[PDB]
Amino acid sequence: DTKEQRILRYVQQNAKPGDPQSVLEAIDTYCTQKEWAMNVGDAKGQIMDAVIREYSPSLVLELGAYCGYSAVRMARLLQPGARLLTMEMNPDYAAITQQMLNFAGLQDKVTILNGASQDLIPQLKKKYDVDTLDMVFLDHWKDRYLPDTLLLEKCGLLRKGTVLLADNVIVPGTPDFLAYVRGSSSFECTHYSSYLEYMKVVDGLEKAIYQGP
Ligand SMILES: C[S@@+](CC[C@H](N)C(=O)[O-])C[C@H]1O[C@@H](n2cnc3c(N)ncnc32)[C@H](O)[C@@H]1O
Ligand SMILES: O=[N+]([O-])c1cc(O)c(O)c([N+](=O)[O-])c1
Numbered sequence: 642d643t644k645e646q647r648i649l650r651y652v653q654q655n656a657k658p659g660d661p662q663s664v665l666e667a668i669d670t671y672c673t674q675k676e677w678a679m680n681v682g683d684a685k686g687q688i689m690d691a692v693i694r695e696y697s698p699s700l701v702l703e704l705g706a707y708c709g710y711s712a713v714r715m716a717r718l719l720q721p722g723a724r725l726l727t728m729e730m731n732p733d734y735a736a737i738t739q740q741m742l743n744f745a746g747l748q749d750k751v752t753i754l755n756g757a758s759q760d761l762i763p764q765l766k767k768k769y770d771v772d773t774l775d776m777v778f779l780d781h782w783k784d785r786y787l788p789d790t791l792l793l794e795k796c797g798l799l800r801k802g803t804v805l806l807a808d809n810v811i812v813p814g815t816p817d818f819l820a821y822v823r824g825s826s827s828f829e830c831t832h833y834s835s836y837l838e839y840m841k842v843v844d845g846l847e848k849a850i851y852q853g854p
């Protein structure tokens with residue numbers, strides 16, 4: 642099996658069905674202790690929670706679902722009637738995300754869009770009944786943040802007050818995106834400093850005592 646199947650299995654065997662907080666904790670525990678994985682993680686996740694609670698978005702777009710950690714993190718805080726749309730181009734990952742959402746009981750709040758954001762964004766208004774977005778979470782391949790921001794703007798999906806929230810602007814880094822939005826009068830920016838998750842990296846010394854030939 643894959644790492645992603647192992648994460649899901651761990652959740653199924655250890656988390657409480659229908660309990661999003663339990664699902665999050667199980668993922669964080671497994672990736673902290675057993676296998677590193679590229680979920681946003683609990684430290685930055687707490688910052689996401691605070692931002693979502695401040696703006697109470699009715700319509701959120703996520704770029705990059707992976708195993709569904711951030712989709713569970715965000716969707717659990719949405720008010721009744723609110724929606725998360727999440728784009729994922731890897732169908733194996735999208736399958737895990739759907740199962741993760743099902744297990745957490747959030748499947749009615751979240752819709753998975755299968756495909757590449759650059760192909761899907763222009764289809765949003767028509768196929769998913771979108772006027773403008775209230776919030777966007779960017780966490781896909783880092784070279785796509787700036788071109789997808791420009792594409793969102795072109796497609797008329799941003800309104801005054803739409804909140805973009807971008808992961809990894811330091812590590813691995815998103816230098817073009819970060820320079821662009823900080824420099825542009827079309828964006829007012831705030832930085833929330835944190836730490837990359839799952840960085841308790843096990844290593845060790847081997848002692849090898851020569852016994853002779
Ligand atoms: C860092 S992981 C997402 C982690 C997730 N946001 C979380 O915190 O649980 C990055 C994901 O973006 C997907 N991806 C990369 N480029 C993409 C694109 N252009 N459109 C859609 N998905 C993309 C990758 O397949 C991968 O699953
Ligand atoms: O390599 N990493 O540490 C990361 C961390 C992350 O949080 C990522 O989103 C990532 N990625 O999308 O490729 C990679």
Ligand SMILES: [Mg+2]
Nearest residue numbers: 681780808809
């Ligand atoms: Mg990330």
